[PDB]
Design a protein around this ligand. Structure first.
Ligand SMILES: Nc1ncnc2c1ncn2[C@@H]1O[C@H](COP(=O)(O)OP(=O)(O)O)[C@@H](O)[C@H]1O
Ligand SMILES: [Mg+2]
Ligand SMILES: [Mg+2]
Lengths: 425, 324
């Protein structure tokens, strides 16, 4: 999937790899700041913070930071600190996402006019990559646009003829060259989205004031030399968890598919559904029945994982749901479609091995387990589920192909009863 | 877009990869479908030299040739027009591009997940100009009861029996999800005369063949009387169906549910398993697309919970008017 990178990561890559006639200014001249920042050590590493006035803003995939008052412009370092005082480390709601402001960029303030703010964007579609330009850049961006075919090359005369019609005449050759260099960098590093708003051009050259971008994470094996230890931050409103990093690390180790994202670690509704699509349907179903505020995770395991792989996946989910008792207990949905080739016996054996090692906690947190699954050897898989639910005391209800895929969700939420006439069927 | 009929009970295919289990599952399907011959003419595996593999046609042991060079397989088996590619993601682009040098191949199935989108865009462009139908990437494939199933699709014999996948009904479907395609096999078989053809287009941002590509084939297939679509959040593909109906191109009944309605209730973005599951504009949400489909005349249920219920309703109204 295409994943967003921070403004800093994108700027670091651009500064390092873009090839352009244009001298790009203030390269690598940024300072990253967190609530833990040692401000004396920061000034040791970045003495330029005292040489001119600065701009400070959060780099956390928050859009229109200006409209939100989250860009302090033309500030001394002391002004940056005072400006950061009511913002750094504070909780903040943007739109409907709530999170902590904790990662800011400090860059030199670049004086320039409004006429010197430009808009550039490149994004991918099925038929190719669209290149956009607008001479009226800035926070208040009708834009010129042209498709670059899949194997087509961006010829600089189309940049000059079409995209820059409304660009000032003097700045046309430097803009043409930068956009041409930007596109090649976009391709080489497998970007799927890249926006620079505003791109600034003064008499001293080109400035990359802002940058938003997505890259094709699947292309790591192609690009890892240049990407380096590249990071994909979570959207503003979410934390990154080590369990997520653990599962993502397993998914990287085999053709099997092991995804996991934590939504509400205190939610009493956990899922361990097989399949990329089925896991979505169960999520749709749970939310359709009013459970959106207790769903703890989204995740799926598929592609015929081994028994050990499935135990490692399952033991992660079980730990996460045994970290604080819930008044009304908790619920675990082990569901999925009728699988095509995944060995339901081998995978459920691995899950059952996890429910054994975690049986104590699962009873403390009053977890009830619901099971619906079909596929290769599903009957043997259903048996060990019902059998571990008895050799532990944990209440498990096991269903098969003779049950609608999402029916166990309604059972788990009390919208429909539990039919004991369908067990193991 | 391209061809209408991809597979028949005489389709012969080449398998790129050492996937013995999937080939045997195909053969078991061919047998209870009463096919005259196996659907897998030969396998390709560049690691080992030319050899032959033990497989079971019913209870009788048979052999299928395994070639190191794709040039030798295509030459010795000119009856083949389908290739099922099990290559790893690192080599799937090359092997697929090599396949499309043999004009005998009209349909390619790309199993691998994780192919960079820029590469799959290049595969699409070559197939587009050569009229090849790509099913994938990141798919289990699809199944045409009575005729042909791609690799692991449909599972083992016991599932092929339970869902009556050894003979066609009148219901064609297309889904993004491979696992849910076998659930559609189960649901459709329990509520209609069964599946006529099913295709899983894969979960990637740019699938080799789109929803409408196969919906169109279904409009042109007489044995198909109704169509089911398990759409998904992300992209604007399903809007082609609204258009198709509006223009008089789509006349047969169409049932559609798009999964991913929960994402409208999340406070921030959540990427789902399918690489293409991301909604980049408001129109790409599952809720927005379901609503647009219902207003275009598509039979849309309230939820997946009730998908089988609406499929049965459309089927019986079709039986009433003697269409089935
Ligand atoms: N380093 C800088 N020097 C001068 N002005 C800047 C600088 N960074 C940002 N600005 C101004 O502040 C505006 C908002 O900053 P920007 O980085 O684009 O964030 P956002 O688009 O989220 O509001 C810019 O459009 C520009 O006018
Ligand atoms: Mg901006
Ligand atoms: Mg998948």
């Amino acid at each position: 999937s295409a994943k967003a990178i921070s403004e800093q990561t994108g700027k670091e890559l651009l500064y390092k790899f873009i090839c352009t006639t244009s001298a790009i200014q203030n390269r690598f001249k940024y300072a990253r700041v967190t609530p833990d920042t040692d401000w004396a050590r920061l000034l040791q590493d970045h003495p330029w913070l005292l040489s001119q006035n600065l701009v400070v803003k959060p780099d956390q995939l928050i859009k229109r930071r200006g409209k939100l008052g989250l860009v302090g412009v033309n500030l001394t370092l002391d002004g940056v600190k005072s400006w950061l005082k009511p913002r750094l480390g504070q909780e903040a709601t943007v739109g409907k996402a709530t999170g902590f402001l904790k990662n800011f960029l400090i860059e030199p303030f670049v004086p320039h006019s409004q006429a010197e703010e430009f808009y550039v964007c490149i994004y991918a579609t099925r038929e190719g990559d669209y290149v956009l330009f607008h001479h009226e850049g800035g926070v208040d961006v009708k834009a010129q646009k042209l498709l670059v075919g899949v194997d087509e090359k961006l010829n600089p005369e189309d940049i000059k003829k079409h995209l820059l019609v409304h660009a000032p005449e003097d700045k046309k050759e430097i803009l043409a060259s930068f956009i041409s260099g930007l596109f090649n960098f976009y391709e080489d590093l497998y970007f799927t989205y890249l926006e620079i708003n505003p791109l600034v051009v003064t008499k001293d050259g080109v400035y990359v004031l802002d940058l938003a971008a997505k890259v094709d994470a699947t292309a790591d094996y192609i690009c890892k030399v240049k990407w380096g230890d590249i990071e994909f931050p979570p959207p503003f409103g979410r934390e990154a968890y080590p369990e997520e990093a653990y599962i993502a690390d397993l998914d990287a180790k085999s053709g099997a598919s092991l995804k996991l994202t934590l939504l509400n670690p205190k939610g009493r509704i956990w899922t361990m559904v097989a399949g990329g699509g089925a896991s979505v349907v169960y999520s749709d179903t749970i939310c359709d029945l009013g459970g959106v505020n207790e769903l703890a995770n989204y995740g799926e395991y598929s592609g015929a994982p081994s028994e050990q792989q499935t135990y490692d996946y399952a033991k992660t989910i079980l730990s996460l749901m045994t970290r604080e008792k819930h008044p009304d207990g908790k619920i675990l949905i082990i569901g999925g479609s009728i699988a095509n080739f995944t060995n339901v016996a081998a995978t459920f054996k691995g899950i059952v091995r996890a429910i054994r090692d975690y049986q104590g906690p699962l009873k403390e947190h009053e977890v009830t387990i619901f099971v619906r699954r079909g596929g290769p050897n599903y009957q043997e898989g259903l048996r060990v589920m019902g059998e571990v639910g008895k050799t532990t005391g944990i209440p498990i209800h096991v269903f098969g192909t003779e049950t609608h895929m999402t029916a166990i969700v309604g059972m788990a939420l009390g919208h429909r009863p539990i039919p004991e006439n369908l067990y193991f069927q | 877009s391209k061809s209408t009929t991809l597979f028949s009970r005489h389709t012969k295919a080449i398998v790129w990869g050492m996937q013995t289990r999937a080939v045997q599952g195909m053969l078991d399907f061919d047998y209870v479908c009463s096919r005259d011959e196996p659907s897998v003419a030969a396998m390709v595996y560049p690691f080992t030299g030319d050899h032959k593999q033990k497989f079971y046609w019913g209870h009788k042991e048979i052999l299928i040739p395994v070639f190191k060079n794709m040039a030798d397989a295509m030459r010795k088996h000119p009856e083949v027009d389908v290739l099922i590619n099990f290559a790893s993601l690192r080599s799937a682009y090359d092997s697929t591009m090599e396949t499309m040098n043999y004009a005998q191949i009209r349909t390619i199935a790309i199993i691998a997940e994780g192919i960079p989108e820029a590469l799959t865009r290049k595969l699409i462009k070559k197939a587009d100009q050569k009229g090849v139908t790509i099913i994938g990437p990141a798919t289990v494939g699809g199944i045409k009861p009575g005729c042909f199933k791609i690799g692991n699709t449909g599972g083992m014999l016991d599932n092929i029996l339970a869902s009556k996948l050894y003979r066609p009904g009148s219901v064609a479907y297309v889904s993004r999800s491979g696992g849910m395609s076998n659930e559609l096999n189960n649901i459709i078989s329990r509520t209609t005369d069964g599946v006529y053809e099913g295709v899983a287009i894969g979960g990637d941002r740019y699938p080799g063949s789109t929803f409408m590509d196969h919906v169109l084939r279904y409009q042109d297939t007489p044995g198909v009387k109704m169509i089911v679509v398990l759409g998904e959040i992300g992209g604007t593909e399903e809007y082609k169906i609204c258009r198709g109906i509006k223009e008089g191109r789509l006349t047969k009944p169409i049932v559609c549910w798009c999964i991913g309605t929960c994402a409208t209730m999340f406070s921030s973005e959540v990427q789902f398993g399918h690489a293409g599951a991301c909604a980049n504009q408001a129109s790409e949400t599952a809720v927005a697309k379901n609503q647009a489909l219902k207003e275009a005349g598509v039979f849309v249920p309230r939820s997946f919970d009730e998908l089988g219920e609406i499929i049965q309703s459309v089927y019986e109204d079709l039986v009433a008017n003697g269409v089935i």
